[PDB]
Design a protein around this nucleic acid. Sequence first.
DNA 1: TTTTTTTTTTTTTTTT
Lengths: 700, 167, 171
Amino acid sequence: RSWIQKVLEQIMDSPRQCVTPSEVVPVTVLAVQRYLLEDEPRDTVPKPPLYCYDVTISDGVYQEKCYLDPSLNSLVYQNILKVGIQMRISRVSCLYNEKRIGQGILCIDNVHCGETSDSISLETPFRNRAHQEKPERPLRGGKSHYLALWNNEDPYGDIWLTDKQPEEHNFSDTKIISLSHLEMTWTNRRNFPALLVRILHKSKLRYYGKPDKKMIEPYQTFLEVADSSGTVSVIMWNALCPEWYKSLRVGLVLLLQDYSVKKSYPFRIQPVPVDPQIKLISTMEICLNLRDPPTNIIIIPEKQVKPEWRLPKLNHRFTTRSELDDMPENCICDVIGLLVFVGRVQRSKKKENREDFWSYRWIHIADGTSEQPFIVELFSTSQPEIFENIYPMAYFVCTQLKVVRNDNQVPKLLYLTTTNESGVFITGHRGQPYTYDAKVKNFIQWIRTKSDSGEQKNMVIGGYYPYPPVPETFSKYSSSIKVESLLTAISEVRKEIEDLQYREQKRIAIQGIITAIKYIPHSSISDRWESQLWREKKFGLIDHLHYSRVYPESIPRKFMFEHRKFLSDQYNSQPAKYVPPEGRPPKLDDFKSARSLGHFEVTILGLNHEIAIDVAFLPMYCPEDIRTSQIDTLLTSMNYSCAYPQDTTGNDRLPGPRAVAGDIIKAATELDRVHIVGILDICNLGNNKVEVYLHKIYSP
Amino acid sequence: WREKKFGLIDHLHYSRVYPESIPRKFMFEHRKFLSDQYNSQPAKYVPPEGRPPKLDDFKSARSLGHFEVTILGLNHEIAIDVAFLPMYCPEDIRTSQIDTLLTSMNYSCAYPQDTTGNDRLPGPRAVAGDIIKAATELDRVHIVGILDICNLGNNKVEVYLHKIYSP
Amino acid sequence: PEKQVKPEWRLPKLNHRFTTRSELDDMPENCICDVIGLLVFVGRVQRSKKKENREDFWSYRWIHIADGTSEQPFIVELFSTSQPEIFENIYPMAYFVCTQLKVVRNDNQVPKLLYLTTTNESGVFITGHRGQPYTYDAKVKNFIQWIRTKSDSGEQKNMVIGGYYPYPPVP
DNA sequence: TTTTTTTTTTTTTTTT
């Protein structure tokens, strides 16, 4: 028999009772689906976690979906409870979903997540066939739905339908009034007639679901649509995004018929159209709510489009690196280029809610117009299939990129960022979606010229990439940070490390003195230096923090199209559901390191000589940068270009890695008893793998 | 019940049968009194004409009594005491015009009419025993109860069980 | 009060590890147990100096509790359990019940030593006729049955009180 | 005592 069935029979007739199971045999996790925790008593002092998770264990005989007790949510937060792990259940309890007629829900009250399972069989049947239903929904609570395991803007599950194709509708007997006319007469007329518009901007999803509120699929997406008489902001309400979101895209002629015109929202701004001729309507807004007969939205095909209507054409503000160099800040633009680098999918905490996160990742889009790549801060645009599976050597096109500039720092910062109404599309060979635009044709011409010339731009994927480089002087660094939180204590650092969540990144500043720096030939005369101060105070340290370890996934690795899937999966966000690995995968140490140096280990003794720490120094600058003076100092972590070397062909005479390592060690030795201000980078790679890499050493 | 009767987080008590919820045989003489008892609340006051009889001195139209059914929650945390007011008569049980003894309506959906003599089936005492037995059968069976809630003015709200769907 | 006790709380029931002399003969040392028997001897209330403070003392006295399960009596080292009314006024021919008795054993000596000792959380209760506080336990019922059998058989166990009784015998 | 941010809302009259 199966441990699942044994436990179920053991605790089936004692609902909501904590019962240690008779026998504990490891079970295999196969999925972790997240959803909102609702219908629980929030009066409790430890406010219930905002979200709860369902774990789909398997026992070799049957696989059953379990509801993890929210008290254990920290395990999923730190990615300890992965997919395909050998967890052992120490406590179990039953629970009946009164909103449904089914069986008990095995509740995992206590667990001991272990190691990976060598036998991950997804062919096992489901003990409770209700669990194996086509629409994958949460165990508890009416018509509940699942959210993306990490962020709230990524569509996830099966409710997100993608089967809305154009339909031929005859417009005879239809009025299709102009948007300006509607703006004039939306406060008097009763039956708002039809509208023929074209989507010009599609924005990310917005999850406004709150606990203990009678809300069903609380999603809203903002669409800007334009006709021959202006443009308006169209908003899709809950229960409509699931059916239409994955299908609606920019450039689709829609026929909205039964809508609701409201006064518009003052806390949300309407993006300016690419073509200024389009008159902007700001006093009006169109709300699309799900209706009984699904006719409120119709995707009119292009073939039916008549020039007589003169519908506005989807334009684009495509920009090239050279042009971007001359564009003021906050000047929206579009970028088409070749992905020559992709970074980890890091996460940041929303400033509004402490339990929500943004998923972002840095990518160096590049073109033939300049020698520097577009640095784009790619936040999730509710396009997980493209965002998660993005790889170098791909023609990438984003839609709405706000320009961000900072000239105070000596390394002038010029990186683009994705806006709310942005979009991501991967292009293939000649411009697939945007061939007509001349800039796309020029980019394709450059691609062909490079291909026939035998030149290939260097490619990288993943790694430790703290793009924003701290300024050259601590005063300028602190000009933005508050005085009370500017610095921390070497002792308090431990809590900072222990507070981060999956891929949450943090930057802290610590006051101390470099005591001993050691060089670790990383890839496959003096490498260690010790300070007399260290030899004296090493025996009187209260707590010597040891975080000078570099993980294999923090080393950027040169991309290889053949191992594309493996390389991508080694740096994406943790998948929600297990998927068996094709054949055997290679070793993450089997790929060449895009870096060009070995990592050092820096020991810092606090100003009071009581506490110490061991950070790891991971410079990303090549010796050519040293020779041409593209680095503020040898103790920094980035060259000014903030980009990896391209087709390195000039290291024949330049000092080798060992010479640069000796220079770095000597520079560190120059700071013997000097109170320096280190800038550390704390990133938690999940599964209790927190990397603490040094960024900059601000000397007096 | 004896095991989980004391650990209940909440216990609803809606097992009251208000006197105006029992159908009552119509007497032509107290026409206005009965109609005003079973019609919508007047807007303006109208003084009563004499002393009308109490509603509890009129013969009921129901053969059986009424039970107090307790429905424990599936999680053994919340209990509700609904009331049961079966409309069916012994004749219905004799000719089998009731789906089950725990149903509040008969197949005819009409009170006994032009009925002269009913002694074939035991009166409205043994039928109560049969209903109690039917409830006893479902000792620990998960069932679904269809409650018919109706607000009878003031703070009087009636919660009367309609049907007990067995697995 | 017990009357207010509801069975749904499922409060734990006061159990007891009642033991008989024959069973105690097979119990390892430091194995706490409970004893119910008939007091067939009581010794002086001797005193011993606390090892912590030189000016404090322990009040203890040896008693030979006995039952019908064996021919040898429970030798119990009864230290004071903050029950002076019972400890001071203990007499033979009384059904005696202690609560937490640690077993003490010494096999090095030829006269194998097997005597129980009162622990910190121990307790003393004198019982009357049929088990007054602990009637329900089957061992108490067996002890009462033996008492009645002895009474109706005209047999009375010899009784003693006080005297010079250095229990622990030197090897 | 401490403690912040977010959106959600459907519908049968007028003619002068």
